[PDB]
Paper text:
Here, we determine mycobacterial MsRv1273c/72c to be an isoniazid efflux pump and determine several structures by cryo-electron microscopy showing specific asymmetrical features including an N-terminal extending loop and a periplasmic helical hairpin only found in MsRv1272c. Thus, MsRv1273c should have a degenerate site impaired for ATPase activity while MsRv1272c has a functional consensus site with the classic enzymatic motifs. Confirmation that this is correct was achieved by mutating both E553Q and D497N, creating the double mutant, which has little activity. Together, these results indicate that the consensus site of MsRv1273c/72c is functional with normal ATPase activity while its degenerate site exhibits very low activity. Thus, MsRv1273c/72c is a drug efflux pump for isoniazid, but not ethambutol.
Using single-particle 3D reconstruction, the cryo-EM structure of MsRv1273c/72c was determined at 3.1 Å resolution in the IFapo state. The central cavity is located between the two TMDs and it opens towards the cytoplasm. The two NBDs are separate at both NBSs. However, interactions are maintained between the two NBDs at their C-terminal helices. In the IFapo structure, the NBDs are separated both at consensus and degenerate sites by 8.4 Å and 10.7 Å, respectively. The N-terminal extending loop (includes residues 1-16, but only 10-16 are observed in the IFapo structure) of MsRv1272c wraps around TM6 by forming a right angle with the elbow helix (EH) and then interacts with the sidechain of Trp246 in TM4, which is conserved among the mycobacterial Rv1272c homologs. For example, the region containing a part of the D-loop, a part of the Walker B motif and the connecting residues (554AT555), which we assigned as the D-WalkerB loop (552DEATSSVD559), adopts a classical S-shaped conformation when the NBD binds nucleotide. However, the loop is adjusted to form an L-shaped conformation in the IFapo state. In this state, the catalytic residue, Glu553, points in the opposite direction to the consensus NBS. Thus, the consensus NBS is distorted in the IFapo state.
Author numbering:
A (entry chain A): -1 to 571
B (entry chain B): 9 to 624
Write the structure that this text describes.
């Protein structure tokens, strides 16, 4: 409501002159469409009331020019209206995307990877459709109305009060009808979404419905939803039924009253009959224009809610940003040094991490094991500045991570997130994200150290296998081992394996772990995992429970003196 | 889609019409009310024209010297050099020494007013009845679609693409409703209006109607030209929007990787390119739709100018009265109106009939098997396969000669490479797919010669995909057996380890799982499903041991709940855990289909080969 204009004023600002030209062309088009009947009236006054016929031919020559002018102006208005309505919409969805690509996944976890997409794809469409219809269909209402009153005043200013009494009555009646029709329209839309949700839930679970034999219970539910939607649609149409007859009735009663009073005026030599021939056209055109405007006006609250969503996106300020003076070292060693980090979430009272402190040496792995819910993935995502610490320090061998040029850091980081993602194209391209210039032997060694060269070697295409949208044509181990291959390509200084190993076969898990420990000897590795089997091989395994590092030391000392041994080891084994 | 290949337009349209048929009383009433409201709408301006003639014959005709009849007045107009004014007079109904006769104008307008009121009432009633009949047919169409969905075989839902049936059933019915309402209301009104207006024009003068109808082929040709020219500009817009949405979703879902690997400016560059490319196409499409809007209005205005000039030249020579030309101008407007809507009418009608073709080809598939009416009594659960052979695709087979001997307390396990189609035995047992040859004997009887309600209600399944529908937790758990009181449902939700997480939640047993759910962790959903299965008191379990986001507390909860669900039931476990595969009796490995192994893990561990390296 208050936000729709807030962006509809800011992102249409470059196309001000386009909208001015659209308005000044619509005015001329509508004034010519109104000026045709008055030339016809001048035909009937100066033509067939006396003997003149050359005057009729001259006025026909005038009407030809008027209609040519009208078509030229109308086509120009269409052109510029389309240009502006697409410029606003090429700019809106771009100020939205250039914003969304500055989030930090803590501001992007609030919206979700699908609500974001619909917000930047279809909400802009719903606002742009409104701009198009309000520059091609709503502008004809005030222009035609006021121009018609002025044309009537000029033609004969004794019957213009017919216009001044017929336009307000119609506008008021249509306002009443629209005010009564809008709520049931929104409710009907909500019920449509409800029945679509019922269908979706019935179709996505068609095995669980057929087991338990619950088909007669799913027919009754859908019948209820269907009858409710039908009743709502009937109650909505109960006013669209009224909307048009009122308009035609006003037009026709005004025409009858026009003939009566205009005849009473003609009798006493104060008018001609061309005025009768013209005022009927004025009435028809003006009131039909107002009718069409009222028809279209039902599209506004949808635009209001879509603009609320887009403003929500465009409002959230970003926290993580490059520093003022980006202190840069010659080469990032990777001696991670966490000191007393908390990272309390934006809204809650439960600091996930609390008083976390440990150092990963220059070339040794470190498994951060703990209860799933104690905030360890938070720790990984804090190391590579996806989230940002609320209090503490996050040294990277000397420099706080809030002082590094973030692109430098991210260039010295090989990350393997929890879920694997592969972008549409060929496996060569996905593996090309790492090094950006990858000879075939490089991709092959990175795919065999990832235990993934088997299924990319035993395929007719080879190292160009078509990858689906999100690598969905693969499954599980394939996707995760392709992600591991992508990360191993870079040869970074810090391998952050978020989970990266859980969704893997334990035998191939050991295989790839040992392959890494053969090739990743001179580097730091950080594995956050819940399974203990991948943790014995670590060197500085640290425990994390309810946001505290309760237990630090090699797996042997830890199993010697800590509850972790009993609980986790005896629960797994 | 910009357009759609209809592949049949006569059969589909006639089938949709006969769908609309059963409301034949309402459709007859709608048609008759439309005819009435159009007749009374075209006989209005004729009466207003008569009133205007009554005014004109008196405002010109009171100035002639009184006493003369309308022959000496005309002759006096002639002799004084006004031959054309003499024509005008001789075309009127002059009586010199007269001039308004306002009683007759009063009666004429009183008649026109009553006709206009009746026409408004008739239009309103027609709109009401049309709304009623459109809804009465849409309700039955949706009900038929649902009754079909509950009869199609699973091979249908499994063969179709992802998210296609949902479009067949959601958006297509909306398109059909739009098409039906539009066709009846607008097409009937506009065709009847054109016909009535043409008849009235012919009654007034058969020449200005020649003008008004010679302007029509140009309108139709211009509409055709612009639509033909604009289709390849709609396909480009649809394509470019598809590409833009693809790039957006693949840069939003994989945002952490797009960002952490460097490719954050390349994504912005590619998006800028796609943005420019979609703008340049939306512009063309919208501009050409615009274009088709006022070109027909230009041609109508050409026709109107011709009519106005020739009518003035004919009235000015006494061959048509003035009310006739006034009525004719009104008729020209009413006639040129629908020629501007024809394009959108055709577009929506074509879209609707394409959607109707899709829906009626959904409604023509084959139902599964018309199951036999025999109840199944699985007294023990001793399943015995007998030479079963399945195919999944007539030709190449997936299962071979197979002779499972699943005993009452047995725990037949299926271990193998994930993606080998390990659910083929599940689908064969629940009778989601028929066996091509063999016999599955569940304690004497065979699952083919028994009903499906009884069989499937006496088995019970716990699959990988947890299905929860819009509703509370209590509703989801009562879905298992919806005639048990809160005592039994609570005993079930306590048998599974649900009560704990219910205590954790603010409003337990009334929390909407999918609506505003937020925190159910998708590991408690598996516990809700296990509770739903334990409520239905099954006797022969089919279930898998796959996981998702393995915790410790919830993992142990699931393990213990799904190990206490298998108290004494015969189970066909898709084993993915060492404890269960250790304690099994008829372990099967599936080599992309094709159970080729057997054994009790002992002779399968001595001859391990594939077995041990797979379970490692």
């Amino acid at each position: 409501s208050n936000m729709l204009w807030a962006l509809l004023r800011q992102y249409v600002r470059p196309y001000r002159w386009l909208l001015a030209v659209v308005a000044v062309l619509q005015v001329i088009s509508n004034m010519a469409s109104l000026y045709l009947p008055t030339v016809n009236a001048a035909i009937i006054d100066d033509g067939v009331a006396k003997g003149d016929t050359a005057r009729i031919v001259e006025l026909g020559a005038v009407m030809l020019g008027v209609t040519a002018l009208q078509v030229v102006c109308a086509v120009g208005a269409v052109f510029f209206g389309a240009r502006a309505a697409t410029g606003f919409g090429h700019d809106l969805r771009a100020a939205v995307f250039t914003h969304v690509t500055t989030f930090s996944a803590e501001e992007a976890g609030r919206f979700g990877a699908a609500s974001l997409l619909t917000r930047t794809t279809n909400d802009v469409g719903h606002i742009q459709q409104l701009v198009q219809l309000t520059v091609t269909m709503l502008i004809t209402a005030p222009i035609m109305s006021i121009g018609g009153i002025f044309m009537a005043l000029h033609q004969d200013a004794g019957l213009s009060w017919l216009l001044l009494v017929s336009v307000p009555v119609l506008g008021l009646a249509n306002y009443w009808i629209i005010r009564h029709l809008m709520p049931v329209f929104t409710r009907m839309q909500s019920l449509i979404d409800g029945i679509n949700r019922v269908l979706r839930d019935q179709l996505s679970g068609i095995r669980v419905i057929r087991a338990f034999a619950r088909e007669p219970l799913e027919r009754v539910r859908f019948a209820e939803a269907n009858q409710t939607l039908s009743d709502s649609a009937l109650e909505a149409g109960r006013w669209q039924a009224l909307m048009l007859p009122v308009t035609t009735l006003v037009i026709n009663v005004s025409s009858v009253a026009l003939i009566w009073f205009g005849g009473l005026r003609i009798d006493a030599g104060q008018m001609q009959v061309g005025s009768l021939i013209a005022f009927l056209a004025y009435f028809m055109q003006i009131l039909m224009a107002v009718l069409m405007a009222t028809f279209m006006l039902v599209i506004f609250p949808r635009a209001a809610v879509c603009a609320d969503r887009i403003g929500e996106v465009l409002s959230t300020q970003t926290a993580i940003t490059n520093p003022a003076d980006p202190v840069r070292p010659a080469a990032i060693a990777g001696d991670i040094g966490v000191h007393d980090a908390t990272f309390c979430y934006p809204g809650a009272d439960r600091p996930v991490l609390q008083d976390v402190s440990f150092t990963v040496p220059r070339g040794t792995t470190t498994a951060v094991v703990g209860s799933t819910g104690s905030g360890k993935s938070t720790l990984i995502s804090l190391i590579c500045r996806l989230y940002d610490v609320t209090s503490g320090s996050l040294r990277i061998d000397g420099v706080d991570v809030r002082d590094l040029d973030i692109e430098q850091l991210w260039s010295a980081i090989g990350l393997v997130p929890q879920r694997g993602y592969l972008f549409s194209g060929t496996v060569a391209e996905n593996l090309r994200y790492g090094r950006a210039d990858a000879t075939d032997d490089e991709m092959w060694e990175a795919l065999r150290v990832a235990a993934a060269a088997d299924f990319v070697r035993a395929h007719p295409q080879g190292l160009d296998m078509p990858v689906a949208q999100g690598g969905i044509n693969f499954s599980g181990g394939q996707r995760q081992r392709l992600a591991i291959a992508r990360a191993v390509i870079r040869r970074p200084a810090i391998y952050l394996f978020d989970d990266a190993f859980s969704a893997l076969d334990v035998h191939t898990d050991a295989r790839v772990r040992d392959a890494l420990r053969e090739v990743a000897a001179d580097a730091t590795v950080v594995i956050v995992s819940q399974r203990i089997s991948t943790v014995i091989e670590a060197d500085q395994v640290v425990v994390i429970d309810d946001g505290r590092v309760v237990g630090i030391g090699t797996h042997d000392t830890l199993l010697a003196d800590c509850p972790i041994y009993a609980e986790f080891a005896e629960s797994q084994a | 889609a910009p357009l759609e290949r209809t592949r049949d337009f006569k059969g589909s349209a006639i089938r949709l019409a006969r769908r609309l048929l059963p409301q034949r009383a309402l459709t007859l009433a709608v048609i008759l009310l439309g005819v009435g409201g159009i007749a009374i709408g075209v006989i209005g301006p004729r009466i207003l024209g008569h009133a205007t003639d009554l005014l004109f014959n008196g405002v010109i005709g009171r100035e002639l010297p009184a006493g003369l009849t309308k022959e000496q007045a005309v002759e006096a107009a002639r002799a004084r050099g006004d031959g054309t004014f003499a024509d005008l007079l001789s075309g009127m109904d002059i009586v010199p020494g007269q001039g308004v006769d306002f009683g007759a104008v009063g009666r004429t307008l009183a008649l026109a007013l009553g006709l206009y009121l009746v026409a408004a009432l008739l239009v309103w009633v027609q709109a009401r009845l049309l709304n009623v009949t459109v809804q009465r047919t849409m309700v039955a169409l949706r009900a038929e679609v649902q009754e079909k969905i509950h009869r199609l075989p699973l091979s249908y839902f499994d063969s179709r693409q992802r998210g296609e049936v949902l479009s067949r059933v959601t958006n297509d019915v909306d398109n059909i409703q739009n098409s039906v309402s539009m066709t009846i209301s607008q097409l009937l009104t506009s065709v009847l209006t054109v016909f009535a207006v043409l008849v009235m024009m012919l009654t007034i003068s058969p020449l200005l109607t020649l003008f008004t109808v010679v302007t029509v082929p140009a309108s139709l040709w211009v509409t055709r030209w612009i639509t033909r020219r604009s289709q390849p500009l709609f396909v480009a817009q649809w394509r470019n929007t598809g590409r833009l949405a693809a790039h957006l979703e693949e840069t939003y879902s994989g945002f952490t990787i797009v960002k952490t690997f460097g490719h954050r400016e390349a994504a912005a560059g590619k998006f800028a390119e796609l943005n420019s490319e979609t703008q340049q196409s939306s512009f063309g499409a919208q501009f050409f739709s615009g274009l088709v809007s006022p070109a027909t209005m230009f041609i109508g205005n050409l026709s109107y100018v011709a009519v106005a000039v020739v009518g003035g030249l004919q009235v000015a020579t006494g061959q048509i009265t003035l009310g006739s030309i006034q009525a004719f101008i009104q008729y020209v407007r009413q006639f040129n109106q629908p020629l501007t809507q024809v394009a959108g009418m055709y577009n929506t009608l074509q879209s609707g009939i394409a959607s109707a073709e899709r829906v009626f080809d959904l409604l023509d598939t084959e139902e599964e098997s018309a199951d036999s009416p025999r109840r199944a009594d699985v007294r023990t659960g001793r399943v015995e396969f007998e030479h079963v052979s399945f195919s999944y695709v007539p030709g190449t087979p997936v299962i071979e000669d197979l002779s499972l001997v699943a005993e009452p307390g047995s725990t037949v396990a299926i271990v193998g490479p994930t993606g080998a189609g390990k659910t083929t035995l599940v689908n064969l047992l629940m009778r989601f797919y028929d066996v091509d040859s063999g016999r599955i004997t569940i304690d004497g009887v065979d699952i083919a010669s028994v009903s499906r309600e009884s069989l499937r209600a006496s088995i019970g399944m716990v699959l990988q995909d947890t299905w929860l529908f819009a509703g509370t937790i209590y509703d989801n758990i009562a879905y298992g057996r919806p005639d048990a009181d809160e005592d039994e449902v609570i005993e079930a939700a306590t048998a599974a380890y649900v009560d704990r997480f219910v205590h954790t939640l603010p409003n337990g047993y009334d929390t909407r799982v999918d609506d505003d759910g937020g925190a159910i962790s998708a590991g408690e959903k598996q516990l809700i499903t296990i509770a739903r299965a334990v409520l239905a008191r099954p006797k022969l379990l089919v279930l898998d041991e796959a996981t998702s986001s393995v915790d410790t507390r919830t993992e142990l909860l699931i393990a213990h709940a799904m190990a206490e669900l298998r108290r004494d039931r015969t189970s066909f476990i898709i084993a993915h855990r060492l404890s269960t595969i250790r304690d099994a009796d008829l372990i099967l490995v599936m080599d992309s289909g094709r159970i080729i192994e057997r054994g009790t893990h002992e002779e399968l561990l001595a001859r391990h080969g594939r077995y041990w390296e797979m379970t490692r």
